Amino acid sequence: HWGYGKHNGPEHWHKDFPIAKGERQSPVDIDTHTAKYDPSLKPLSVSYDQATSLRILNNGAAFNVEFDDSQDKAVLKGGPLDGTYRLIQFHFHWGSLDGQGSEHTVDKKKYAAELHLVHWNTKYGDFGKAVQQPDGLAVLGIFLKVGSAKPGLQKVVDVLDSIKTKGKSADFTNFDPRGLLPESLDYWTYPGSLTTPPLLECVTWIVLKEPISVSSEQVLKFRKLNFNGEGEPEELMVDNWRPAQPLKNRQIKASFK
Ligand SMILES: [Zn+2]
After folding, report:
1. In terms of CATH, what superfamily is 1-257?
2. Cα 137 to ligand 1 centre (Å)
3. Quick count: other Cβ atoms within 10 Å of Cβ 40?
């Protein structure tokens, strides 16, 4: 099955998922000089005050913090979006070393990690129907650099020991994702895809310009997770990022000058 090893990594995914070579694949390099300011773009509206986290799961590709999405509790609206998108989960991608780990890049710069807050368009009723639509998902991407600790991340870091291996989960209630946001909500946006199989071309990407800072110790703990299941040879969950894909016939728009 697909993964991030030498034998099953991103360069192999097209054999099972031919859309991997499609016209609107993610992630991409964000060339800052070519992204054009679009004065028609609105401020992003991030409404997470009533977010209800439930569980954290190691799915063998990353860890997901899952939310109750049975009602409009934590929603993303505005920005480039038409309509209301409900938060279902967040997860990260990260590297074996601080100099790599992000999926998007900025003028070819790789950050240490990248947070994806995944939201689905409520007009399609459920996540499964949403991923079949070109405007079905909105993913808020936030870069992580290593420096000062991010206090609002520590609760996530501290539970990781309990979900070391694929298939493990732990209760994870009352987590406030507002603690993972940077100060500014300035962003780039473009149409793209899921960055893991099935690689569906159903995502409006919104990537924040301002990275958050996390400490070396925080990200070191990410790197102690495992891709493997319990009792299997240990494969550290590191370098779980898909590299940048061709931009093709797309324009990246900036919300800021
Ligand atoms: Zn992701």
Report:
1. Alpha carbonic anhydrase (3.10.200.10)
2. 12
3. 8
- Domain boundaries in the chain? 1-257
Ligand 1 centroid–CA 38 distance in Å is: 26
Using alpha carbons, select from 45, 43, 47, 39 the residue that is nearest to residue 71: 47
43 Cα: distance to centroid of ligand 1 (angstroms): 23
Q: Residue 198, exposed/middle/buried by CB under 10 A (0-12, 13-18, 19+)?
A: middle
Q: Reported resolution in A?
A: 1.3
Whole-number Å distance, alpha carbon 49 to ligand 1 midpoint, is: 23
Q: Number of H helices and number of E strands within the chain?
A: 3, 15
The encoded tokens of residue 113 equal 């990690």
CA of 50 to the centre of ligand 1 (A): 23
Question: How many angstroms is it from 235 CA to the middle of ligand 1?
Answer: 20
According to DSSP, the residues that pair with 254 across neighbouring strands are 37, 188
9 Cβ contact partners less than 8 Å away, ≥ 6 residues apart? 3
User: Around Cβ 18, how many Cβ atoms within 10 Å?
Assistant: 10
Report how this structure was experimentally obtained: X-ray
2 Cα–ligand 1 center, Å: 15
Where helices occur in the chain by DSSP H, the ranges are 127-130, 154-159, 216-222
Q: Give 244 Cα–ligand 1 centroid separation in angstroms.
A: 13
How far is ligand 1, taken at its centre, from the CA of residue 105, in Å? Answer: 14
